């Protein structure tokens, strides 16, 4: 059913309770030192204490840098915001690169808003005013309460409201037999419709007959929604504004991405702090994964300097396979990973190593199991030798074409002949480059 991506086997970091990486566990093999460092980083993130800490994953391509980052994501779970991003994403036609970077920074800070709504729900059995000879003198018709009888499937309750609720009772077309919601706090009546018991099959009006509320009259309990700080920034930057001239004119114009000001983000910070102080909100800071960080230019790294030093920043994981590369945006400034030395100064470098043939064999077997491929031991050995010759990705990718060839042949296993034929049909970078030369 589910589609198998290149990282669908990575389920975690495969560390024992002591913090040590098993030889192979939870889809990862080898790279033990890097997985242990990533476990330390997972604990740092779970501590929710440090802001704007950066780790660079550095190593040759195919050494599991993205595998390790996605393992970190799996270890943190779905509740922690994991924002993946490529360095090419900063070059927007609408907003500046700094704005893209800051927006992605605000997408890694999560917020759990817990709001408890208290409502009185039911079908209106009676609307009777309570009359009194109460007033501070006066020969008029006085009421001190409005009796509303609300009927749910569970039972019936008679509510006695402020007499001022009579205005909204007929402002809303509330009669007996109508389904209503009476905000416990707001005290605003709200006619959902009419009860579906008073609904013949010969009635054409629709969106008027709502089922009788289930359960008790008095309940709406807590609604919990998870947002990012960027969601709040975007929402408060341009209001929905669907009620007036804003509606037609703004919708008619294209909604471009804007360069949100620091004023708005500071106000959002203040509001979120007040929400957390009131207990309505919980802050779950996440991790921002910048893959191909070498695609960022010098301006982007210079901004990252300031973005990583803010108390509100997430944890940032940089991946870079560049050996000694000219920094984008500079003509002849080479720094180790295409990253300026002053950005590497405020980073912690986790280095990934080339896999030995046995580790490649284990990875290939794990990938075969993930893809639902039965592979003979001889085929596995030959594919490991191919990967030793060419690369891990190439050998990993022969699995599904070879399985298809075996299926076409009537087999349900990958044998040496199938992998040999697929190796002959498809070329790797080395052989193609030899052909080109």
């Amino acid at each position: 059913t589910q589609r198998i991506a290149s990282h669908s086997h990575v389920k975690g970091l495969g560390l024992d309770e002591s913090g040590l990486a098993k030889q192979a566990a939870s889809g990862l093999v080898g790279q033990e030192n890097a997985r242990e460092a990533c476990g330390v980083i997972v604990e740092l993130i779970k501590s929710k204490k440090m802001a704007g800490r950066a780790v660079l994953l550095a190593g040759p391509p195919g050494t599991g840098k993205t595998a390790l980052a996605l393992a970190i994501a799996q270890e943190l779970g779905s509740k922690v915001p994991f924002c993946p991003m490529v360095g090419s994403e900063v070059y927007s036609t609408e907003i500046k690169k700094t704005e893209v970077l800051m927006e992605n920074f605000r997408r890694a800070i999560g917020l759990r808003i817990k709001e408890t709504k208290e409502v009185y729900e039911g079908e209106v059995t009676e609307l009777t005013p309570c009359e009194t000879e109460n007033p501070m003198g006066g020969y008029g018709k006085t009421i001190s309460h409005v009796i509303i009888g609300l009927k749910t499937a569970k039972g019936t309750k008679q509510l006695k409201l402020d007499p001022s609720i009579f205005e909204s009772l007929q402002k809303e077309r509330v009669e007996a037999g109508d389904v209503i919601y009476i905000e416990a706090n707001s005290g605003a009546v709200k006619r959902q419709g009419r009860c579906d018991t008073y609904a013949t099959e010969f009635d054409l009006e629709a969106e008027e007959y709502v089922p009788l509320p289930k359960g008790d009259v008095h309940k709406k309990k807590e609604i919990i929604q998870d947002v990012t700080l960027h969601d709040l920034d975007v929402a408060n930057a341009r209001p929905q504004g669907g009620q007036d001239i804003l509606s037609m004119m703004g919708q008619l114009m294209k909604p471009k991405k804007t360069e949100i000001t620091d004023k708005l983000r500071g106000e959002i910070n203040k509001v979120v702090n007040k929400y957390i102080d009131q207990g309505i909100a919980e802050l779950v800071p996440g991790v921002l994964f910048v893959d191909e960080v070498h695609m960022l230019d010098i301006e982007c790294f210079t901004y990252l300097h300031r973005a990583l030093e803010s108390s509100i920043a997430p944890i940032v994981i940089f991946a870079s396979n560049r050996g000694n590369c000219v920094i984008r945006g500079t003509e002849d400034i080479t720094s180790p990973h295409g990253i300026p030395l002053d950005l590497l100064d405020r980073v912690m470098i986790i280095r990934t190593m080339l896999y030995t043939p046995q580790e490649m064999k284990q990875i290939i077997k794990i990938r075969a199991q993930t893809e639902g491929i039965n592979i003979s031991e001889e085929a596995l050995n030959h594919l490991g030798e191919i990967g030793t010759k060419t690369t891990l990705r190439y050998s990993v990718q022969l699995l599904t074409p070879a399985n298809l060839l075996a299926k076409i042949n009537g087999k349900d296993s990958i044998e040496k002949e199938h992998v040999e034929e697929i190796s002959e049909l498809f070329y790797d970078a080395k052989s193609s480059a030899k052909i080109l030369a």
Partner: protein, 431 residues
Amino acid sequence: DVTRIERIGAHSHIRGLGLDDALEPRQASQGMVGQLAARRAAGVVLEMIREGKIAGRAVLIAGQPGTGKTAIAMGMAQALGPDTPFTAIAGSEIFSLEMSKTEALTQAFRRSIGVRIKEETEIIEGEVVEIQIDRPSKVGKLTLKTTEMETIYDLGTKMIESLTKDKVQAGDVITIDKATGKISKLGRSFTRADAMGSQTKFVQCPDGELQKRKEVVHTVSLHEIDVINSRTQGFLALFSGDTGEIKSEVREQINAKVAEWREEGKAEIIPGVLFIDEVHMLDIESFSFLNRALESDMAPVLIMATNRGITRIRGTSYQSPHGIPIDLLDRLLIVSTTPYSEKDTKQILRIRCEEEDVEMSEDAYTVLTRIGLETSLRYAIQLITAASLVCRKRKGTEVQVDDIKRVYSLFLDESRSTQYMKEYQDAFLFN
């Protein structure tokens, strides 16, 4: 006889990928001859696409110019057939003033994943016989009629307002959506068509049940959903193309909602193929994005074609095998095309002449095959039609070697034009 919008193109004769059910390429089938190994590889990749299990698998078609890479791509598209998205773009199409190269690649990817959404509607259709006085809070009756039934409906205020706003009149066919109470007038009665005629359209009365359950399957792409959700009237961007950098949050929400629908059985995801012809025209930024866009669970199968040798990657000073960074080359499988022998060129020319509907003598075929081997395949293909026209001007039924020589002298190939230029190069501007 009649000309359609589609006519004889470069690849119009490639009806599919000519390989057995064992994926063994026949020497000449479905308008494609030769390139046996590359056609077998294309069949394997096509089976991958049809299974739709593995996400973001990248295939590169490499080889010399005129070796059939776009022919193989069009054959794959023709074997795949409609209703499986095959998006074909050039690497140049991603450089837009509307949106970033990253955004353009994202849209191309979202356009190669197809979604089939089914819904139940439960509508009422019938010819209206009567709508009576609502003057009282208004209350009225509606009489609807099929060829087998008629019923009378008691109208609430909202339905009365909808009916009076659409000016629904006795003797017209409406459909009412029960969930929404939405009135759609689709035609006028069959008692006239009897002196009328206007924007109106005439429909005969519905037969069967007034109230009908109905399953409609809607085919869209992820890009279409993205642009529909991008803004309130964003569906207009499907026409104008004025999409403008759809938000990432919208795309995550759409991915989650699509996953929900797939779990609910509401939606069916059909992953497709994105074909980028001339992928050497991409920047290193675009290749960097492709590295990661393929690692998504909703990524299609990416097919790219390039005739480059060992060239510098665009936007960089680095020499890479196919003008493509080596990190992306590890992420894909490379299909290489062998040049064409005399037999293969002759067969290709024969198929092209069949497409043109032009008859050529065997001596003419020998001469044109030799010309193509000397100059290029495409030049021979063009000489086909040129010699057909020269033969027709001569009032002949078969193209002779004389006509081929005539068109050869009339039209030059790159080498001969370069030579004539070179002996006159001081007359040409800038070298």
